[PDB]
Amino acid sequence: MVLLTMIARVADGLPLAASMQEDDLQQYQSQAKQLFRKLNEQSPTRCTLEAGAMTFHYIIEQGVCYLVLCEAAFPKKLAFAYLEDLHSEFDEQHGKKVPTVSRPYSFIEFDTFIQKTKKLYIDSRIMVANIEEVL
Amino acid sequence: EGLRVVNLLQERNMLPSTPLKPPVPNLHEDIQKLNCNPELFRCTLTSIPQTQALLNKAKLPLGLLLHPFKDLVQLPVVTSSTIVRCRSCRTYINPFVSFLDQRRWKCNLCYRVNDVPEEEPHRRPEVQNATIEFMAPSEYMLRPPQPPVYLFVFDVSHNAVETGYLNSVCQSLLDNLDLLPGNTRTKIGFITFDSTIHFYGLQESLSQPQMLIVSDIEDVFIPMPENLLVNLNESKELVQDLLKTLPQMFTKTLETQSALGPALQAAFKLMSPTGGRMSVFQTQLPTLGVGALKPREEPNHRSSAKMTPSTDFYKKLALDCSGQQVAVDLFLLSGQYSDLASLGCISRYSAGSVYYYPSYHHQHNPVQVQKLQKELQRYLTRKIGFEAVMRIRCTKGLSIHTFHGNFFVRSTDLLSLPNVNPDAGYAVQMSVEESLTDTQLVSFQSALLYTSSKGERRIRVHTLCLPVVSTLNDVFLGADVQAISGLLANMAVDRSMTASLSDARDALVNAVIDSLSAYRSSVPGLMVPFSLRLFPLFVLALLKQKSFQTGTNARLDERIFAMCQVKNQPLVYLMLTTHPSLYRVDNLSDEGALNISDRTIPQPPILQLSVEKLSRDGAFLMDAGSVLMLWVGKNCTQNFLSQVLGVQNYASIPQPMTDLPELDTPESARIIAFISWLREQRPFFPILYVIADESPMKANFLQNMIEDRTESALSYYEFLLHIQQQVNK
Amino acid sequence: TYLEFIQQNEERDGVRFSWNVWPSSRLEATRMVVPVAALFTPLKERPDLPPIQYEPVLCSRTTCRAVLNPLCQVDYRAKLWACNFCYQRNQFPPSYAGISELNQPAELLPQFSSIEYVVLRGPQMPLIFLYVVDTCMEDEDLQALKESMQMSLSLLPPTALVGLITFGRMVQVHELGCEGISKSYVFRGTKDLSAKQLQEMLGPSNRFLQPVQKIDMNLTDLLGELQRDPWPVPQGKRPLRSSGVALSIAVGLLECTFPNTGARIMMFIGGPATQGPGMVVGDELKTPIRSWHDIDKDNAKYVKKGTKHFEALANRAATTGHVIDIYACALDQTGLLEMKCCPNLTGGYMVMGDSFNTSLFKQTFQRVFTKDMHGQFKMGFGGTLEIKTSREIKISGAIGPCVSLNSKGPCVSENEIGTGGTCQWKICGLSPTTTLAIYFEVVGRGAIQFVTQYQHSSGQRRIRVTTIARNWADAQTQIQNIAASFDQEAAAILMARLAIYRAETEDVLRWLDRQLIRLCQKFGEYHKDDPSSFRFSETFSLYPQFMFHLRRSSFLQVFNNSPDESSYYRHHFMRQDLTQSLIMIQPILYAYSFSGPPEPVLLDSSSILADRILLMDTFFQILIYHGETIAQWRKSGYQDMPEYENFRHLLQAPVDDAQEILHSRFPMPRYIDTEHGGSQARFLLSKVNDVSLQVFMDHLKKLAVSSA
Ligand SMILES: [Zn+2]
Ligand SMILES: [Zn+2]
């Protein structure tokens, strides 16, 4: 029922696209940048991470991590279902160009698709671990 | 050139006929060739005093004038995966570094040796260009690159409707809707306000744009979580329909009170989550709600120097907008006193800019209509940077202690620039905290980190190197009279608010007295060095500019806006306004620059600002930077009236003549060529007005004759006589 | 005969008295077990009623001012009439100078004891309908509400003014008629606003209340594309719905624009108010909305302050003269308990359902706008009911949809009952079915005059005058003459309204029991200490059975119902006439079998024959029960066979005998088709049967023959 979305290249943690709306974000995106650095070729394929009252869901495909942040009370099953909608569209449009870029947020214009498919979520109409362990 | 000494009472014709060039610092040939462009970054003293004692003896201010975001012709951009910085002070790698071990470079600012990374290092683009732009890595941003957001806030009170400004503003937005800087992520929004706040929803789902009115003035809020700041590209058609509608929605309104304060609080709440550029259009004194301002009696010519805001509201609000990366640009189109001394704070501390159109009216004032037209064109189409930050570093021993310009200074002298516009000029005062005994060169480097309209984090860097001298004469030999006048103009504005207008004027006069008195005590008449031969002239021009004049008919908002221009315009346009260029344009010659292939562009001699240079037999053009006035003599030639003006006699020239006609005469083909050469040297298109004849109620051309006398200001020769009496006391 | 008397006086005067012969002595007047009271319907329709376009004759005594009526003594020779209330002699008006004996004024004919006048003097004000729409509901329920809204707009007279207020988290006051911009005023649904404030913040017809004849095109496009409240509802939480603030702005808008004229504030809600003043429940789904169980244990801290907010608006609306409807359709409760005062103090409607997207609501809603044979609505506005009585009669008070005007007089009794201390009441909304309960007190014949001034839906200002008279009890046969005039049906309902009024503003059954025993001890025949000897006359024998069903009904035993259902049931009972009220207390039961035509049976489980088809009529639902062998040969699919067509006459006789009244009753009753073993047969088993009527009667007779 609230938001934080990030897409990063798993190899070096290079950000690709993100979506953030406030009206906090300082501490919560900092640990998303910390997890993006800890991911490697050995990381779990799909995982769920709990930060006390909040909750992380991420998937990794084609060396691209699709992380979402959200408080704990949100249905985990549907959170992955939306990251499936993100990974599919990204792989279609710029999946051919993600091992080529080097600048941060090279696909920041993908943000126009992240907020629209998430309003199709925020509205009604796998591993378990704690984040303080992975970091 | 010349180490020569000038007596300003015998010459009296000391101004050259060629444009003033910034003084080349006395540096080695291989070091000056790499120095940054002087119009981007310059110093009042090209020869830096070695000690603070030496700087105090010269009685001249030490400081920098910079134009960091100016439009460039060629800008090298390096996309290096890493960026090289001195590990102790983070100064960027610059041309004025020295490599020692071919693996170690010696930063020119803090004297700590650093190691170059494994990534001929001396002639990489970062050491061959003082002006350079970088691609910032991910750690140089606190959030994803923000989208470009443009929120326009319109006053639509009864007085605002009468001025008819909304028609041009909406028409200008329509014409330049595809030219606003940005990508597909461009956001746009609209707020109108009278006694209440009106939001506008833009949904492709419904036939019309929605109008949501918030009437709770003492507790504003956002009426809708969406469709207020819309993506311009996907709802382009509905934004266009609203712009075509707004000018006709309040034609018969009777709302006379304006709730500007609450409207800005609502506007701030709207773009608070993202940031962007807020364009505020106000036409009268705000009188309803928070930020209400009391009326004030306007001065007259008999009132002595006798400035400050009435409330801190618009300052506190600007500081809130700064923290959310919101810059507020204030367009004041008022016909009566609006207390700009308080409203202007909304732009000063949000790194915006103030635009003023005194007594704007769509029919009665054709000058302001065409000035708003061209100023909106530049405003809406010029490049822009968002959530920007600027820091200025100098070599150890030099300390910045005062900043000038539209921004907010934070801890460790960090300049917050919510927006950075390419027409903003900044100034800095510095002193010698510790003597520069060991060093012969010093450097000044400004770094401008911003988010471009395309969503990529950029760092624009300028580096300036200067020599260090240890005698009084060498400090004078490297003085930049224009940069000194500019820094002095900014200091006087702060003094006028800290103390009064008379104190600011005394400080401007004393700056010439004390400086030349110190020079006289270092060497019968008024003797000045060659670098300061124009110092009394320009300071006299400062004291007759609209910012600091006395026995004038100037009003409060006029003077305040003149000071806003002093604190925000680059130096080059402060000089053109303060001391305009004067040319005879009734007989132009082939002595110019017939080099641009098929264009002459004559080079008439620059005349001094005295009516004694005029003549009733010709027509002369004056370049005041923002406007070009062509005074035509009553007894002008028959050739000039018909071949360049298209008129058979002096009495048939139209009273409001907005431009010269492009007649087919080599005289008209002439005069259109030199005017076209001056205009493309500038950002805001300067309109030209040739309606100034004998008595067309437009004779402000004569007040720019700052060397003549009046019953309220000294002439130039009297000013020199006044100075000499104090240098030899 | 005294039964023909009851029916003929209810049809002519719209009045049903508990006693039609009144006590002539102070001892019997105070020893009156059931009070002398009347079920009075002010605007009861009539087959042969002619509008009388002239000002009503008024007694020329400053205090009296009674209307000329068929009980006055007239002298056609002296052009003089004597008032029957104060005996003041009055000169006939110059307009009556030529009235004759052969041709009398209609006001003096006994057939026109109830008469209506038309006062045409001032410019008529149009009707006003302010829609207050909740947008916190699924699009299926929102679009269905939108559809039935545009239907109501199609029925309104063109001159009628309409406004639209949508709300959810915020509340929007729409200014219709705007071009190219469609503007509205948005307010925080968390702060209550006074009428003076709303007038300042907003700036015959207004910008917000416009003639539907010139803005219905703009409204049908706004209403057509009204969408759900845009604010996201987080998981596990209710929508933020500001129903209390939305109402106070709807009230405040009409208070400062069209006060003292007819107008309906129609609020459509799809859930409880979860924010601002009027809050009913918090916004967390894990804590349920208050139940009667929660109310008793004080586990409901919102209902007390939530009620005070809405009864503040109710008294503000009733003082201004406006009526408030509530159309609540939601799967859960909605807050009728706290909001009931708004349609109760005014004459407003209360409609309840599971969803606006049901045939039940959509037909219930279009029943609001039924017209007569002149094409004009069956609603009246701004009613002022003044009652004048003889020197003996004093008014205790009124139970029903009204508000006291607090006008003191010599006919005002000190013993107040319900809305008392006055002889004038304001009824902001009434239909031909609105029924008040006025309670009297005695301190030849006695006369009472009901004068109802109201605004007709056509804009005419009308005055309905009803003058009745009942014989004083001749003292040589005092208790006997009074006993024969007892109206057991009216008394039971009049006593029911007393019990409900005390319960809804609190033991009630103890008072109901003691009055039943006292009535048995005064008007029953028996020897002491022999319960087998107790008998009631034909005038009283049905009263105990009515009390038996009353003390077990959902009106007094509120558990097993949600607090909103109890308010809904009591709302409709305090307004209905005698016929429908008896149906509420004691449902009517008809039987359908091969052995004879349909016929009424007793409400007892000895009538739930397997062989029969039952037709139960509770006022709120129409049920058709199918017995054991009945459900069996229906499940056999044997109706479709052609040689049993008497078959089809049986299973569709109650269905046909249901549709004719399933369309006349304003709150369309729920329809049921259940059999034995079905889960919906519970409604029949619970209304059927201390323990039972047999056991109840034995205990009543055991106590009626013992100590008084
Ligand atoms: Zn360094
Ligand atoms: Zn009388």
Residue numbers in the entry:
A (entry chain C): 1 to 23, 29 to 130, 148 to 157
B (entry chain B): 346 to 464, 476 to 662, 666 to 882, 888 to 1093
C (entry chain A): 3 to 205, 225 to 464, 475 to 537, 541 to 723, 746 to 764
What does the paper say about this structure?
About a half dozen export signals have been identified to date, almost all comprising short peptide motifs, all of them binding to the Sec24 subunit of the COPII inner coat. The ΦC export signal was identified in studies of p24-family and ERGIC-53 proteins, and comprises a C-terminal signature of a pair of hydrophobic residues or a single terminal valine residue. The ΦC motif contacts a site on Sec24a that is also the binding site for the LxxLE- and DxE-class export motifs.
A series of ΦC-signal peptides was synthesized, based on a core sequence of yeast Emp24p, and individual peptides were soaked at high concentrations into two crystal forms of human COPII protein: one comprising Sec23a/Sec24a•Sec22b, the other Sec24c. For all ΦC sequences, we observed clear evidence for peptide binding to a site on Sec24a in the Sec23a/Sec24a•Sec22b crystals, based on the presence of residual electron density that matches the peptide sequence (this binding site is occluded in the Sec24c crystals). (D) Schematic diagram shows the bonding arrangement to the potent ΦC motif Leu-Val. Diagram is based on the structure of Sec23a/Sec24a•Sec22b bound to the sequence EVTSLV. Thus, specific recognition of the ΦC motif involves the terminal carboxylate group bonding to Arg750 and Arg752 of Sec24a, with the penultimate hydrophobic residue of the motif nestling against Tyr496, and the terminal hydrophobic residue fitting to a pocket of hydrophobic side chains.
